[PDB]
Amino acid sequence: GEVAQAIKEVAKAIKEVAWAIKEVAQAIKG
């Protein structure tokens, strides 16, 4: 369904946030 699929897109985008934060940790480490 379209509402479920849209919520799945929100989940995917939040995973992108997690990855970007892992990039921040990596930057801090060098």
The owner of tokens 């897109």 is 9
Q: Which helix (H) or strand (E) holds 1?
A: none
Region 1-30 residues binding its own copies, contact defined as CB under 8 A: 1-30
Token couple for 16 = 């992108």
Distance, CA of 20 to CA of 23 (rounded, Å): 5
Minimum distance, C-beta of residue 28 to its own copies, in the bound complex (Å): 4
Residue 26 CB, shortest distance to its own copies, in Å, is 7
Q: How far is the CB of 12 from its own copies (least distance, A)?
A: 7
Interface residues toward its own copies, by CB under 8 A: 1-30
